[PDB]
Design an enzyme around this catalytic site. Structure first.
Site: not given
Length: 147
Positions: A82-83, A97, A107-108
């Protein structure tokens, strides 16, 4: 050194905790940390407990960790990546986060679900994390919290 920095980050987060988060290195590997995020109130995550991990490269602090969430959550796809400021600690990273988790942007690693599925997953997270031996053994206080 990645390890000398992560040792510092540990003492620092334990001394100076951040809201909704608990983080622990694996006893067998300082480059892998697990975390728990408590879903804040007034979000669809409220009442949920979300287990994830950070996997730090040997090049840390000069390269970021990879970030994963393990608990089904409605926001991020599970078990998938993740980002850069090397001064950012494990604390700043986890706080960032969660800031991302509570927003709506993509996001990714993001997934699109409804607030009532998110709400059902928050109910489901309690029993999901209690069946996880690693969760239970790294976060014995959160287990007591959840119970």
């Amino acid at each position: 050194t990645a390890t000398q920095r992560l040792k510092q980050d540990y003492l620092r987060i334990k001394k100076d905790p951040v809201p909704y988060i608990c983080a622990e290195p694996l006893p067998s590997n300082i480059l892998e940390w697990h975390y728990v995020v408590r879903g804040p109130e007034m979000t669809p995550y409220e009442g949920g407990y979300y287990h994830g991990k950070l996997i730090f490269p040997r090049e840390f602090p000069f390269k970021p960790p990879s970030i994963y969430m393990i608990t089904p959550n409605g926001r991020f796809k599970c078990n998938t990546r993740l980002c850069w400021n090397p001064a950012w600690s494990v604390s700043t990273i986890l706080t960032g986060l969660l800031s991302f988790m509570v927003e709506k942007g993509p996001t990714l690693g993001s997934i699109e679900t409804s607030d009532f599925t998110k709400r059902q997953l928050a109910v489901q997270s309690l029993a999901f994390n209690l069946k996880d031996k690693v969760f239970c053994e790294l976060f014995p206080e959160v287990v007591e919290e959840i119970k």
